[PDB]
């Protein structure tokens, strides 16, 4: 079908993953029509904290949490706010600070993918409900 | 019944639960060996998302999804991947955003357990064949 796409950062990685999947599902993004359902991407942040430390005092386990908020407005009901939280824990390698960044960034790309699918799957779920 | 246990996070709660759940099944854990089937824990992630919001505003119920990716390589045969996901929904109370904490985490341990169990059973089947 079709839908209106709105993002607070049209250049964001997450806004691009949604786009890709909207295309793979033969869904055209109409020009923000009225009677057409809208998907609004509000924000997405990333958080990285220390989970546990080694007897030395230096980080052993990190916890990453990707947060994302979006909103769906189906024709016939007021927009609805949705939040997604993805938690991922991992062990800190002894490698360099740079090798740590390379690693973390890799897991983030995977989290954004999970987020992207959840958004669409989540939106489809609210669609099959308004049918009542 | 024995095997070797490889994990990305030796300290991860999952690793611990699959171990105390592995002994509880009379399974011995040994070091790497060409004649010993390996169980590899690759990744586990948790996902939380708004499922239903109260007629007032605050989030009524939430949905929890625990993903686990593991591998099983029998002595001789090539290693093969396995994915498993657990979904559970809960109702949130108007309590403090801090009391609910000790709750959900208890809800997650039950899921990690449920996952550990599944990893075991899914391995008992990959060998029975």
Domains (ranges, CATH) in chain A? 1-132 (3.30.160.150)
- For residue A114, list chain B residues with Cβ-Cβ distance below 8 A: 45, 47
Sign, CA dihedral A93-A95-A101-A106, equals negative
User: Mutation test of the interface with chain B: which of A42, A60, A85, choosing the one with the most B Cβ atoms within 10 A?
Assistant: A85
Cα dihedral B72, B77, B81, B84 sign = negative
Instruction: Give resolution in angstroms.
Output: 2.6
A54 touches chain B (CB under 8 A): no
- Chain B CA closest to residue A60: B11
Determine whether B77 is exposed, middle or buried from the number of CB atoms within 10 Å of its CB (0-12, 13-18, 19+).
Answer: exposed
DSSP letters for chain B: -EEEEEES-TTSHHHHHHHHHHHTTT-EE---BTTB-EEEEEEEEEEEEEEEE-SSSSEEEEEEEEEEEEEEE-SSSPPEEEEEEEEEEEEPPSS-TTHHHHHHHHHHHHHHHHHHHHHHHHHHHHHH-
CA A80, CA A62: separation in Å to the nearest integer?
33
A91 and B9 within 8 Å at the Cβ level: the answer is yes
Cβ <8 Å between B47 and A87: yes
Q: Are B119 and B15 in contact (CB under 8 A)?
A: no
Reading the block at residue A88, the tokens are 């991922």
Two structure tokens written together for A103: 């690693």
Solving technique for this entry?
X-ray
The residues pairing with B81 across neighbouring beta strands, listed in sequence order, are: B71
Nearest C-alpha of chain A: how many angstroms from B76?
30
User: In the structure encoding, which two tokens stand for residue B84, read together?
Assistant: 């498993």
Strand partners, B47: A86, B65
B44 near B67, Cβ under 8 Å?
yes
Q: Is B122 on the interface with A (CB under 8 A)?
A: no
List Cα–Cα distances, B124 to A45, B4, B69, in angstroms. Answer: 41, 14, 17
Q: Which one of B9, B45, B59 has the shortest CB-CB distance to A87?
A: B45
Buried b (16+ CB within 10 A) or exposed e, A24-51: eeeeebeeeeeebbbbbbeebeeeeeeb
Q: Do B45 and A86 touch (CB under 8 A)?
A: yes
Token code pair at residue A129: 């409900």
Strand pairing report for B28-29 and A28-29? unpaired
């Amino acid at each position: 079908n079709q839908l209106s796409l709105s993002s607070s950062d049209e250049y964001k990685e997450l806004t691009r993953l949604v786009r890709e999947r909207l295309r793979l599902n033969n869904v055209k993004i109409v020009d923000a029509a009225n009677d057409v359902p809208v998907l609004r991407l509000i924000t997405d942040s990333l958080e990285r904290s220390t989970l546990s430390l080694y007897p030395t005092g230096n980080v052993a386990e990190y916890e990453l949490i990707y947060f994302v908020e979006f909103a769906v407005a189906l024709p016939g009901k007021e927009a609805q706010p949705f939040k997604i939280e993805i938690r991922r824990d991992y062990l800190d390698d002894p490698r360099t600070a740079l090798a740590k960044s390379r690693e973390m960034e890799l897991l983030v790309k995977e989290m954004r993918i999970q987020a992207a699918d959840r958004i669409l799957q989540s939106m489809a779920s609210t669609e099959v409900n308004l049918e009542h």
